[PDB]
Design a binder for this molecule. Structure first.
Ligand SMILES: O=c1c(O)cccc2cc(O)c(O)c(O)c12
Length: 293
């Protein structure tokens, strides 16, 4: 109504995303339309709280619009997402200093969200947005918390499992901030090697891809694992792969940090705050990406 619907910039996890121009402000924004029983009031209040979340590494949520018994989220617009940039960059790779800058910024964003008791739980390259200024920002949180997580995306789209933490796959009902660190670890590896770390095509394939690389978890490395809801004693037992085979040719600082983000036990997994202190970031800078828009 008040927007020009420049274009449809994608099909998001909770619904379609459009680029739109505000006729009033002349502002260009990203408009997300969400799924019809009249909607929960709980989600509206929860999501509305998110407008308050402000940080250079988080995509700004400008407005929540509930009108006509519909739900729209109005976000600040960024021109490119990391998935597109990695594809664009697949021939030459993303330079390490830019990988490092992006990881550092994403951890700052997570540290902020997590200290505010906000989880993403859906992280993936498609929801990490970048600009010409060298910034990267976390988008499209859901919140899967304010909302909930049904079978498909919106209409017949296939959910990506590649970034899902093992505790989610094993049926843990209570997610912690550790799930976001796991996903970001997977994204870090993918920037480095230029292929997804764990590209599972099903929940069990996702789980077994993890096990084949990191070893099948046991009570030694992950106390309580064999009691998890979906754990089966019949899981094959794979040996852990020497870690230098996983993200060559990343240096030992990077491998060390990745290994800490990928710990099986969510309690041992490094926090975003602790990760920012890791020696990998001693030389961090903020390079300009080459973006073709
Ligand atoms: O917030 C966004 C979101 O929540 C979900 C999906 C896609 C997006 C795509 C964009 O280009 C953008 O600027 C965004 O701001 C989002």
């Amino acid at each position: 109504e008040n927007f020009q619907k420049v274009e449809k910039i994608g099909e998001g996890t909770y619904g379609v995303v459009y680029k739109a121009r505000n006729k009033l402000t002349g502002e260009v924004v990203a408009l997300k339309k969400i799924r019809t029983e009249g909607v929960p009031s709980t989600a509206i209040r929860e999501i509305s709280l998110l407008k308050e979340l402000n940080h250079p590494n988080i995509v700004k949520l400008l407005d929540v619009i509930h009108t006509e018994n519909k739900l729209y989220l109005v976000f600040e617009f960024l021109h490119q997402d990391l998935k597109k940039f990695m594809d664009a960059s697949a021939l030459t790779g993303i330079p390490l200093p830019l990988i490092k800058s992006y990881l550092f910024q994403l951890l700052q964003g997570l540290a902020f969200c997590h200290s505010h008791r906000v989880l993403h739980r859906d992280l993936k390259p498609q929801n990490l947005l970048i600009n010409t200024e060298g910034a990267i920002k976390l988008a499209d949180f859901g919140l899967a918390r304010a909302f909930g997580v049904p079978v498909r995306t919106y209409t017949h789209e296939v959910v990506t499992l590649w970034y899902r933490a093992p505790e989610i796959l094993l049926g843990c009902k209570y997610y912690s901030t550790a799930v976001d660190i796991w996903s970001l670890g997977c994204i870090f590896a993918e920037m480095v090697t230029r292929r997804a770390l764990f590209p599972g095509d099903s929940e069990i394939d996702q789980l077994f891809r993890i096990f084949r690389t990191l070893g099948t978890p046991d009570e030694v490395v992950w106390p309580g694992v064999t009691s998890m809801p979906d754990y089966k004693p019949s899981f094959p037992k794979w040996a852990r792969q020497d870690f230098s085979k996983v993200v060559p040719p990343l240096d030992e600082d990077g491998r060390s940090l990745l290994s800490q983000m990928l710990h099986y036990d969510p309690n041992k997994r490094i926090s975003a705050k602790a990760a920012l202190a890791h020696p990998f970031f001693q030389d961090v800078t903020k390079p300009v990406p080459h973006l073709r828009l």
